Amino acid sequence: RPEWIWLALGTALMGLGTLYFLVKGMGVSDPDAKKFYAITTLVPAIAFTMYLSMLLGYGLTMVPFGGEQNPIYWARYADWLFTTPLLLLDLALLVDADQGTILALVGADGIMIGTGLVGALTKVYSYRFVWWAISTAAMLYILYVLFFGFTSKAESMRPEVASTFKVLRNVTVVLWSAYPVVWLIGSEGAGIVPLNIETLLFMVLDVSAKVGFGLILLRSR
Amino acid sequence: RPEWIWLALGTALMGLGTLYFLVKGMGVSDPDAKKFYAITTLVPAIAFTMYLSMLLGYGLTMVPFGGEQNPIYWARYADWLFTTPLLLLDLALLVDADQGTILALVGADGIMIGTGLVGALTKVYSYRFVWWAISTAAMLYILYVLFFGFTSKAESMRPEVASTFKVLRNVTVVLWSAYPVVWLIGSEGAGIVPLNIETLLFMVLDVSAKVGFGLILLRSR
Amino acid sequence: RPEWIWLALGTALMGLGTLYFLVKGMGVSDPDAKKFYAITTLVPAIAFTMYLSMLLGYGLTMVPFGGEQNPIYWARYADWLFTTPLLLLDLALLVDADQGTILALVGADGIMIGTGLVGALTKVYSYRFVWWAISTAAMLYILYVLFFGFTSKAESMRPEVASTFKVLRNVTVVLWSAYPVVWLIGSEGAGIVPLNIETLLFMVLDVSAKVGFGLILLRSR
Numbered sequence A, B, C: 001r002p003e004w005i006w007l008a009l010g011t012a013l014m015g016l017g018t019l020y021f022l023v024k025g026m027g028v029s030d031p032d033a034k035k036f037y038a039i040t041t042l043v044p045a046i047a048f049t050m051y052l053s054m055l056l057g058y059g060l061t062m063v064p065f066g067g068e069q070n071p072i073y074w075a076r077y078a079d080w081l082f083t084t085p086l087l088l089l090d091l092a093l094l095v096d097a098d099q100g101t102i103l104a105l106v107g108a109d110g111i112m113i114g115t116g117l118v119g120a121l122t123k124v125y126s127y128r129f130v131w132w133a134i135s136t137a138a139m140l141y142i143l144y145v146l147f148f149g150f151t152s153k154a155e156s157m158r159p160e161v162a163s164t165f166k167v168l169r170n171v172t173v174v175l176w177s178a179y180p181v182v183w184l185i186g187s188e189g190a191g192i193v194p195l196n197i198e199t200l201l202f203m204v205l206d207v208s209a210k211v212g213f214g215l216i217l218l219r220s221r
């Protein structure tokens, strides 16, 4: 399938973006700046790793459904499993948040990725959609604590902090909305948009969120 | 098997108890109160999720043993894997504990659930019992740091704190004792009590611990 | 295979070393000393658990490669998955480190064990070596933050602290270097050194690192 030219493209970028933040953060003496550079460079590194497994083949196993065996891309749920909490912990660290607030976000996020995978590998039943919906519920709570909650706290900060968070939250809500759209439309969902294109859309939102988020946040607060 | 009318019953309650703490905690402005509401609502939510997987079928795979294939309910070990550390972290957060104390509890608890699963899915050998015993050892240490350790620290607090912890520890030790009893007696163990009843007993202790713990603790400290 | 007399030997020692730190730490009233005893006794306990699974057989599954099915010892990647971050968190706790510093070490370590396993269970392709190399990269970063980074901070402490860290870092860098050597030379890698001997080498470095590290650090700071 031509999807290899999208995995190949991704592994290239994610790996480069990792090598990029790796050399930029080599100077950070400051603790807080050192900290943000920690999360932000940890998320792209993982993306590369999984994208390699995805391309090489390890992260691809045929799963029954209906009457035919379909191309499951479970490695995506491994990337997302860690990559995601780190990105949320990132924002909450910036916009000084509560242990209750961060522990719950990452809690509902963990339900977001896990519930998602469960339905991604559901035996064969069209019960997949039910899990999709549970993930939707979860993601709705996530973008609520993010949007409305944090912004208020973003007003307790200097213009830089309120600004970076502004763009970051924007990018974060928008990108995280397109994900479940690409999922339902493609493989795991119906099959309307083929895997080739689905894998491109996901690779696009993936390179977008993780590297964009890095470049925008990394811009000195 | 009639066990579906126990999974169905559970998923109903766990999910409702989740929706309940979800609406009660919407008002918590205070940080500490916000925090406890975080753990306490995170544990029931997970229980529901897994109970759905349990009912729908995902969390049920046939495993060899002796000469016949048996009904393994591994999803229980996924629920317990997270649900448990959160409940211990809960109590230790109330009765102000040490990083050494909490990190070790959750450490021995993680050995409690993992060792448990290993023997729950042991190939076919009657080596299952050995793992059971290791879990017993682990759980003994757990109820020791809980009972004797924390109570002493419960005396350094206001009557509310010493009180809630009192009932909470009571409920926690009692319920956590019945669990390994139901395990040895049923499926994974001998087969004395059928799965139908075992699944009821587990669903009872499950709805009991998680929702009861929530209602009792949630009662303002 | 005679490798059972190495797993048996290991499970014996690891379990004993666990029982040893368990009785020594029963007196620690001090918080910090209590804390270090927490990590240090948690790592050996896990080693025993997995070594039992390794011996009994659970942690051994035949995997295709080339044309013949090979003896994969995945349980090692379960031990290492947790045992390792705990040992690094240990050193960083001693030589007062940053959240950025500890979160990144444990981050690159998690990539160390995961990437390692991925290639340990790679379908059959000689793509195993590529993952080996990624692990090498990861481990290189790890021993860099350890060696050069921490030592500088080791100079901000009393002679005891600078001393224990000295020996600990020595033992840690040396032992962690022999590991990937034993891996490439044996099973997962080429097949030069048989599993019998490989399992001995690994059991030696395992009993060495975890119990030695414990004895040396546990020596009052």
Ligand SMILES: *C/C=C(C)/C=C/C=C(C)/C=C/C1=C(C)CCCC1(C)C
Pocket: A047, A080, A083, A084, A087, A112, A113, A116, A132, A135, A136, A139, A176, A179, A180, A183, A206, A209, A210
């Ligand atoms: C770097 C990668 C990021 C930020 C990935 C984020 C992924 C999601 C927010 C995924 C959400 C999903 C659902 C809500 C339901 C279907 C499954 C997912 C994972 C596509």
Ligand SMILES: *C/C=C(C)/C=C/C=C(C)/C=C/C1=C(C)CCCC1(C)C
Pocket: B047, B080, B083, B084, B087, B112, B113, B116, B132, B135, B136, B139, B176, B179, B180, B183, B206, B209, B210
């Ligand atoms: C909400 C669920 C809770 C609090 C579940 C707790 C479960 C246990 C304490 C289980 C203990 C077990 C053993 C000691 C050995 C056999 C396996 C278990 C999981 C039944």
Ligand SMILES: *C/C=C(C)/C=C/C=C(C)/C=C/C1=C(C)CCCC1(C)C
Pocket: C047, C080, C083, C084, C087, C112, C113, C116, C132, C135, C136, C139, C176, C179, C180, C183, C206, C209, C210
């Ligand atoms: C108690 C056990 C310890 C400290 C184990 C440490 C193991 C390692 C540092 C392993 C490193 C590896 C690689 C760099 C590549 C091949 C796979 C490993 C796990 C052998």
